Amino acid sequence: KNPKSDKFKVKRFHHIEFWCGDATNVARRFSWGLGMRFSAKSDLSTGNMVHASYLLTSGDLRFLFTAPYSPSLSAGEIKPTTTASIPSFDHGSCRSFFSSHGLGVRAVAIEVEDAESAFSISVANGAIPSSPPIVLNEAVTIAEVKLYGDVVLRYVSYKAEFLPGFERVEDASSFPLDYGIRRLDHAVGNVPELGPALTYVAGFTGFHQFAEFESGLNSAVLASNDEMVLLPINEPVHGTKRKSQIQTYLEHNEGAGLQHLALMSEDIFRTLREMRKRSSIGGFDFMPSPPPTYYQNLKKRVGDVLSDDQIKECEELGILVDRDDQGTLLQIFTKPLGDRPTIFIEIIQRVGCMMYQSGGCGGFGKGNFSELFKSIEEYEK
Amino acid sequence: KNPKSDKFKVKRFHHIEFWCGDATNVARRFSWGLGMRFSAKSDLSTGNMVHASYLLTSGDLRFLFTAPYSPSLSAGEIKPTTTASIPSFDHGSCRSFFSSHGLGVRAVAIEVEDAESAFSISVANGAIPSSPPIVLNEAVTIAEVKLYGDVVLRYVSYKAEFLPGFERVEDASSFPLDYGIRRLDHAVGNVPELGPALTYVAGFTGFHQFAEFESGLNSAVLASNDEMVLLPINEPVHGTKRKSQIQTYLEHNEGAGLQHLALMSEDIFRTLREMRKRSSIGGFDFMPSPPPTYYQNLKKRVGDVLSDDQIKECEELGILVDRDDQGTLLQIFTKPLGDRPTIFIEIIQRVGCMMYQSGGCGGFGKGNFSELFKSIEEYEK
Numbered sequence: 233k234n235p236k237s238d239k240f241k242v243k244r245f246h247h248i249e250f251w252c253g254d255a256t257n258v259a260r261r262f263s264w265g266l267g268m269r270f271s272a273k274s275d276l277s278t279g280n281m282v283h284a285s286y287l288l289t290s291g292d293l294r295f296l297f298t299a300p301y302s303p304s305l306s307a308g309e310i311k312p313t314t315t316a317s318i319p320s321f322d323h324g325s326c327r328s329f330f331s332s333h334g335l336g337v338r339a340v341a342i343e344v345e346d347a348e349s350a351f352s353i354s355v356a357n358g359a360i361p362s363s364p365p366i367v368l369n370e371a372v373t374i375a376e377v378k379l380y381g382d383v384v385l386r387y388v389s390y391k392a393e394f395l396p397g398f399e400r401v402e403d404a405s406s407f408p409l410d411y412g413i414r415r416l417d418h419a420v421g422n423v424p425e426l427g428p429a430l431t432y433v434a435g436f437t438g439f440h441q442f443a444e445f446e447s448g449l450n451s452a453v454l455a456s457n458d459e460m461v462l463l464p465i466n467e468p469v470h471g472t473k474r475k476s477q478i479q480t481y482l483e484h485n486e487g488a489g490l491q492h493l494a495l496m497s498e499d500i501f502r503t504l505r506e507m508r509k510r511s512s513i514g515g516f517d518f519m520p521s522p523p524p525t526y527y528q529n530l531k532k533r534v535g536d537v538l539s540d541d542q543i544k545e546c547e548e549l550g551i552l553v554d555r556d557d558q559g560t561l562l563q564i565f566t567k568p569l570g571d572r573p574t575i576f577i578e579i580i581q582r583v584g585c586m587m588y589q590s591g592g593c594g595g596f597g598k599g600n601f602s603e604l605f606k607s608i609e610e611y612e613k
Numbered sequence: 614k615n616p617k618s619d620k621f622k623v624k625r626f627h628h629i630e631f632w633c634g635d636a637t638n639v640a641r642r643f644s645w646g647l648g649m650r651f652s653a654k655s656d657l658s659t660g661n662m663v664h665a666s667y668l669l670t671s672g673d674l675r676f677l678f679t680a681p682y683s684p685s686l687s688a689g690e691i692k693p694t695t696t697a698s699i700p701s702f703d704h705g706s707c708r709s710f711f712s713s714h715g716l717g718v719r720a721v722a723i724e725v726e727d728a729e730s731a732f733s734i735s736v737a738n739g740a741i742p743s744s745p746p747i748v749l750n751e752a753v754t755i756a757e758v759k760l761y762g763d764v765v766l767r768y769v770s771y772k773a774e775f776l777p778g779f780e781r782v783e784d785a786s787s788f789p790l791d792y793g794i795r796r797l798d799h800a801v802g803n804v805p806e807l808g809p810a811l812t813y814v815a816g817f818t819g820f821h822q823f824a825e826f827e828s829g830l831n832s833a834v835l836a837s838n839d840e841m842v843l844l845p846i847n848e849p850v851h852g853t854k855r856k857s858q859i860q861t862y863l864e865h866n867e868g869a870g871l872q873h874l875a876l877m878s879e880d881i882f883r884t885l886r887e888m889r890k891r892s893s894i895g896g897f898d899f900m901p902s903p904p905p906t907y908y909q910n911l912k913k914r915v916g917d918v919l920s921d922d923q924i925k926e927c928e929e930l931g932i933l934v935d936r937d938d939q940g941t942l943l944q945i946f947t948k949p950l951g952d953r954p955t956i957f958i959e960i961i962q963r964v965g966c967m968m969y970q971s972g973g974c975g976g977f978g979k980g981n982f983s984e985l986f987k988s989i990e991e992y993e994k
């Protein structure tokens with residue numbers, strides 16, 4: 233059931249912004265590890281005395297990395313005279329965010345028809361304002377409301393490349409890496425209490441609950457009208473024998489925040505081959521692979537969807553598989569992206585639900601919790 | 614003239630420690646960009662609830678990257694019960710350092726015969742204490758005094774791998790990169806006033822002035838008895854037509870600090886080929902190359918030391934050349950390592966002064982300032 237209750241017109245995920253202490257080093261690491269090209273910048277060389285911001289792209293996926301300069305460089309400015317390209321930026325907020333959470337996502341940005349309208353309707357419907365709508369060079373409007381913890385939902389709308397004041401990166405400095413990643417599929421938050429989090433976010437967006445089918449979590453997924461903006465939220469389950477990874481997140485993150493970003497690949501086998509080649513030379517590590525029992529049991533569950541060789545290719549790469557009543561999902565998870573056991577990345581590819589592919593085809597892999605347990609115990613004996 | 618006036622026995626540069634906001638991403642970027650292997654760690658997985666520290670090595674060169682965890686993880690500890698592997702570490706100091714300076718060097722560490730003695734004699738001779746001597750697992754002693762700005766000189770001495778509490782990194786996670794870098798040759802500080810800086814440091818070390826031969830700087834080099842520990846210091850020259858890069862450093866760094874690290878290569882041609890291959894895929898960029906006039910003028914200055922082909926190989930790679938009365942120096946400079954125009958890296962190789970090679974053979978390239986100016990103007994007309 234999809235009531236299509238969005239309170240304003242939502243298009244697609246637009247970008248994810250990481251708040252960093254040094255944007256250069258994080259961006260260069262992510263670029264190599266994920267095969268994303270350097271495509272725009274806003275920094276000292278473009279007249280920005282406030283923050284350094286570097287944009288990586290792969291397909292439609294946009295990762296923005298931002299860090300503050302010394303406030304002394306801009307101590308003469310006021311908001312009307314600012315050289316910041318992102319007017320919501322604040323030195324104190326950024327430093328407090330990074331010192332509290334370490335490296336993580338500050339903004340989940342979605343493109344909307346009208347960011348001022350989206351902001352107004354949101355706040356009229358309970359959203360906590362974070363940064364009021366601001367029109368950039370009479371061309372782009374940006375506005376921010378609180379999502380959870382210190383994460384904001386950012387609304388971007390265009391009259392009519394990234395943002396005004398960003399410069400396209402010279403192609404000598406821009407190497408065309410590409411491991412097959414194409415867009416953001418979903419962005420997942422961890423909170424202490426799922427109920428109030430859902431009530432708040434669904435309250436100001438009109439996003440609806442996306443229908444699903446002792447693992448440490450309860451979860452629910454909020455979705456836009458065409459279910460292409462997908463925002464799952466987790467809460468921990470306490471008392472379990474094994475400590476909830478959601479609770480570990482909250483402890484090491486100092487509270488709520490973004491847990492993982494799921495990046496859609498047009499060829500998950502190529503993506504994972506390329507990423508795994510680079511794991512030990514500056515890229516990303518992957519969680520320990522499932523035992524071969526898991527892949528033996530894959531014939532009985534998706535043998536009509538994947539060939540024996542395609543299943544073999546999953547086993548070499550550690551890929552996980554789950555299935556809905558409508559589609560099949562291939563997924564795998566990185567180890568945490570930084571020092572803390574907090575944010576990680578999921579790579580996914582969806583098979584089915586062709587109409588274009590409908591959003592969320594195959595679900596989010598909730599069955600792989602059960603299946604991982606079974607396979608692990610099976611392998612032991 | 615070398616009076617050999619060291620006030621305590623100094624051996625070699627031991628390591629350089631960067632204070633980071635996320636140690637993982639900086640270390641992975643540096644590892645790929647410089648061809649340094651991951652060789653030890655101290656972090657949550659080793660019982661350290663205080664800081665994440667990752668060690669990269671290439672030959673004898675040791676780069677340490679450290680970042681704080683949430684203070685809540687260790688809020689029950691006291692210094693007698695600390696899980697930190699570096700007892701001088703302080704959350705507040707680290708966060709204040711990184712927010713003030715961005716990514717940069719916190720500690721220049723030298724190995725000495727007796728770190729407690731080195732600390733005591735230093736402080737008796739004007740050194741400002743930073744962290745008192747502490748014996749780690751009855752095997753290693755560490756002590757710190759202020760060097761300049763928020764940079765410390767760290768004394769390490771061994772009774773008898775890195776430090777106690779660090780674990781050797783599993784070889785699956787440890788890819789044996791190597792682009793030819795072998796040791797730290799010198800570490801250079803920028804200060805507002807050279808005179809008082811030199812008087813202070815030479816005062817508590819007994820290090821002597823290493824003899825040299827409108828560029829923005831005055832400088833002088835302090836050296837240990839065998840001149841293998843080399844600590845140049847710069848001050849800006851004001852009023853010039855072109856703004857002093859030393860003054861730009863001080864402004865963007867919020868005061869004094871480490872300007873560059875010079876890393877000796879056993880094969881600078883291989884190092885620069887390997888580093889330049891990776892510049893646009895996660896590694897380091899290099900300063901713009903000299904005009905071909907510079908390389909035309911190289912025959913007249915070092916034609917007895919480098920063949921025509923070896924000079925051609927310098928031109929392809931942008932390498933600079935200078936000469937002493939005793940040796941020849943090959944050098945090149947990276948662009949800044951992070952967001953701010955502050956710290957950078959120099960790659961060097963020295964030819965001559967064989968006895969082992971004596972420290973500082975060939976000087977530090979001060980003549981390349983003059984020669985760059987001449988060559989640039991020559992190329993124009």
Ligand SMILES: Cc1c(C(=O)c2c[nH]n(C)c2=O)ccc2nnn(Cc3ccc(F)cc3)c(=O)c12
Pocket residue numbers: 418420451452453464465476477492494519565578596597598599600601604
């Ligand atoms: C993250 C994830 C998803 C996922 O992406 C979503 C689930 N619900 N929604 C809305 C999602 O987007 C699906 C299946 C999974 N199966 N096993 N594991 C292993 C594991 C690693 C560390 C730890 F501490 C505990 C367990 C996963 O992490 C896992």
Ligand SMILES: Cc1c(C(=O)c2c[nH]n(C)c2=O)ccc2nnn(Cc3ccc(F)cc3)c(=O)c12
Pocket residue numbers: 799801832833834845846857858873875900946959977978979980981982985
């Ligand atoms: C850093 C350096 C050294 C060096 O390493 C040392 C000099 N004295 N001592 C003790 C050293 O260790 C030697 C020769 C050089 N020749 N040209 N340039 C170009 C330049 C880049 C940016 C800017 F803003 C201004 C000018 C250098 O940077 C350069």
Ligand SMILES: [Co+2]
Pocket residue numbers: 418420492494578596
């Ligand atoms: Co997911």
Ligand SMILES: [Co+2]
Pocket residue numbers: 799801873875959977
């Ligand atoms: Co130098």
